[PDB]
RNA sequence: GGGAUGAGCUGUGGGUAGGGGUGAAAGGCCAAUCAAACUCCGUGAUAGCUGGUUCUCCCCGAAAUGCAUUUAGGUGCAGC
RNA sequence: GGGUGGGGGAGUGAGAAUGCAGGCAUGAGUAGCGACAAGGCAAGUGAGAACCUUGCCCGCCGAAAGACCAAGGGUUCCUGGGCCAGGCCAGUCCGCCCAGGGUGAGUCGGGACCUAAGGCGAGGCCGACAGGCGUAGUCGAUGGACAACGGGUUGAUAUUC
């Protein structure tokens, strides 16, 4: 009975985080595109 | 099972109108000089004080 | 520039722990929420002209409040807790005699 | 007494047992108890029969008042007063009064009380 | 209002006409079996009454 | 009901990514979706197919056949 | 803010698309109100009590339905108020609403110490570009090394005072 999501904060950041999404220019360019957009998170 | 049809006005209202609160009978009591009425099967406890007239 | 003792300490803590303590002649101040124990230590001593035993800290995050339709957020503090060495003068508050 | 027809008083038997020891003791304790009519109701001759045991008030009588009632201090005052105020009463040492119902489920309540 | 404003006798008063009106109704959520979701609906009354003084 | 010292179970951390992975192999599983995930874009994809298409009156008023057709529930020309 | 007339222009007319949005019916005062531990009395409070408070009975768990952590949550903790939303009923109660308060470490759990799988990777090699991989190095606990016990106290902290 166990459901997808189990919360785990370290790996949330290390999969989805600010300096993942940095290092490659697939994830600069979503960073890029959610500040055009005007997104309140990256 | 599911209806079928939604029922007309008539045919629903003549089942909702039998839908109705049976209206109780109230006696005369005479407690503390004042005077009350109480459903008959209360008369023991009007007398003897128990009945909260509120 | 030049750098006062008097930018770290922001106000006292003025509550019934506080009162508390006071009697035992321990003192709770506001920090600026970026300072650390030795600097505390330091800036007493050299504005109350006191000796101090020992200074604990402790954060304490803000509570969220909803105003009209979304959450706000109020300041995170950080509180010292400032005990004078056994026979030192007392801290004046000026206003605080619990 | 004659048993119960129909399901019983809180659930199982077990617990009836219990529901109606619990109202005996309170009644002797205090003389008067307010609770619903069908609880009264059975608790009207439960109540005569440890009456009568305690009129009749002999060691063998206590005992079996002792088998269904749990409260030394209540099987006492019963065995000290109410069993010889009852002494010249041939049964009926009971009384219910029906009362105005309660919010919540209007459940049908009555008092049950002892006759002086 | 009858018996202070109108100085009427209450002894005479009977109930004329009374009525319960729709006031407006609170939609609420309940989750059911399966992922629906059912609505509930919170209803309230407008209440009116006249009393009249009449012998 | 089966296993329950083992080819065991489990926590924490990590790795493999879509004609790709992983698979004691069922086309199983890869975020309630898998004989090729999901999101955005091409994009208002295309559909000889199904459905829908909104006020009025006056005049006239059919066809459901022939030929051809990767054609036969479509279309072109003739007939009306 | 309109009427009439000569002209001009249309997002110009809906009953149907298992059309879209909103409001409202029928089913209907119907099903249901979420474990098979179980409640009762007396007194209190209050406008209002089956459910709130106090006391006493009764019953249930007890390799948990008790007591501590980690992850996760984020103020849900305490005090004083509140009672039209919420709580599958009511509610004077509340994990709900409002204000204020509350988390104290040389020794506990982490860093400032060490490294594993793995990641990043100065130069570098390779690759039309985009980039791939990797050395030195540097991160990375779930592991290694390293110093505190007993009692008391608050409404709320305690190997911390
Ligand atoms: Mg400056
Ligand atoms: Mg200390
Ligand atoms: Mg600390
Ligand atoms: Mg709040
Ligand atoms: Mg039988
Ligand atoms: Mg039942
Ligand atoms: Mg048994
Ligand atoms: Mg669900
Ligand atoms: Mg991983
Ligand atoms: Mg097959
Ligand atoms: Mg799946
Ligand atoms: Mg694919
Ligand atoms: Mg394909
Ligand atoms: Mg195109
Ligand atoms: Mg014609
Ligand atoms: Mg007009
Ligand atoms: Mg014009
Ligand atoms: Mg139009
Ligand atoms: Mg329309
Ligand atoms: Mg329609
Ligand atoms: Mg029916
Ligand atoms: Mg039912
Ligand atoms: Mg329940
Ligand atoms: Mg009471
Ligand atoms: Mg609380
Ligand atoms: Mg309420
Ligand atoms: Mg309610
Ligand atoms: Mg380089
Ligand atoms: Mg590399
Ligand atoms: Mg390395
Ligand atoms: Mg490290
Ligand atoms: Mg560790
Ligand atoms: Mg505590």
Known sequence: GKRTFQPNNRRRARVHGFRLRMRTRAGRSIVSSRRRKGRRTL | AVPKRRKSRSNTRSRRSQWKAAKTELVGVTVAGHAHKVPRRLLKAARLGLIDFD | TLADPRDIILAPVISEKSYGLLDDNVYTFLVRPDSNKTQIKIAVEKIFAVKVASVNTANRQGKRKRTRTGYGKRKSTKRAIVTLAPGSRPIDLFGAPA | ?116 | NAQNNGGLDPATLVVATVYADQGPTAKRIRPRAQGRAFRIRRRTSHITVVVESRP
């Open chain 4, 1 to 116: 007494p004659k048993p119960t027809k129909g399901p019983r008083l809180g659930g199982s038997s077990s617990h009836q047992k219990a529901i109606l020891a619990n109202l005996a003791t309170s009644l002797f304790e205090h003389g008067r108890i307010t609770t619903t009519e069908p609880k009264a109701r059975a608790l009207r001759p439960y109540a005569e029969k440890l009456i009568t045991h305690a009129k009749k008030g002999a060691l063998h009588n206590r005992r079996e008042v002792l088998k269904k009632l749990r409260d030394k201090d209540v099987v006492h005052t019963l065995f000290a007063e109410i069993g010889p105020f009852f002494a010249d009463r041939d049964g009926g040492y009971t009384r219910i009064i029906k009362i105005e119902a309660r919010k919540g489920d209007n459940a049908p309540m009555a008092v049950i009380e002892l006759v002086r």
